[PDB]
Amino acid sequence: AEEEKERQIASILSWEIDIIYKILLDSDLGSSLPLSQADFGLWFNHKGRHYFSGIAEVGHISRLIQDFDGIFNQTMRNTRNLNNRSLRVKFLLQIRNTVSQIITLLRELFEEV
Amino acid sequence: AEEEKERQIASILSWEIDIIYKILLDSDLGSSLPLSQADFGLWFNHKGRHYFSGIAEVGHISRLIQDFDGIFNQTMRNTRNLNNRSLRVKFLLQIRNTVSQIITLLRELFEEV
């Protein structure tokens, strides 16, 4: 219960850092996966939604994941951007904001049930 | 047990993300703290070492934390370096390696007991 919560929080944090270092070191996404295809995204869609069925914050996390998928795919269609500092920073700001909100809502979901 | 393992991992990852963004955005450490003074570093010194007393991996974690204090001060005495890409990348790798190694050892400690 509480074990599963911390595990998922560490999971999404691990995914974010992996992508951040890919961007900072290599100026590219490369083998990175969108959140929906990452460890956390698969847990949330396949297991998380059903365990948290009928709780409002679930729809909010799904939206955040979905919104980032779009941002992620757009950049995937343009790694010319990640060499550019401004476009690099923009993306880096977007991932941090997405993960931050999700963790807080995820905390809320686990406490609620 | 497994819960505590994941919680501390989430804690050090949180610190790592914060300092990375401080570096990326402001090109200086500024209000950043070395790991030893963040939540995890304080937890390890006050609670972690004693709970895992006499186990070799503890001395290794203390070593990594102590070493980063020195790395932190050297970089702090030369924030001109964080403007230089190579020296910035050098520091970011020092951070990733310090955190990665500590996490691996922290896992080792928790599985053993």
From Swiss-Prot, chains A, B:
Induction: By RpoS in the late exponential growth phase and upon entry into stationary phase. Expression is higher at 28 than 37 degrees Celsius. In rich medium DosC and DgcM are the major RpoS-dependent GGDEF-domain containing proteins in the cell, whereas in minimal medium it is the major RpoS-dependent GGDEF-domain containing protein. Highly expressed on solid medium. A member of the dosCP operon. Disruption phenotype: Disruption results in a 2.5-fold reduction in surface adhesion, a 3.5-fold reduction in biofilm formation, a large reduction in curli production, a drastic decrease in csgB expression (400-fold reduction in aerobic growth) and in an approximately 3.5-fold reduction in pgaA transcript levels in comparison with wild-type. Changing residue 46 to A: Same biofilm formation activity as wild-type. Globin-coupled heme-based oxygen sensor protein displaying diguanylate cyclase (DGC) activity in response to oxygen availability. Thus, catalyzes the synthesis of cyclic diguanylate (c-di-GMP) via the condensation of 2 GTP molecules. Is involved in the modulation of intracellular c-di-GMP levels, in association with DosP which catalyzes the degradation of c-di-GMP (PDE activity). Cyclic-di-GMP is a second messenger which controls cell surface-associated traits in bacteria. Is composed of an N-terminal sensory globin-fold domain that binds heme and oxygen, and a C-terminal GGDEF diguanylate cyclase domain. Forms a complex with DosP. This is Diguanylate cyclase DosC. The lineage of its organism: Bacteria, Pseudomonadati, Pseudomonadota, Gammaproteobacteria, Enterobacterales. The gene is dosC.
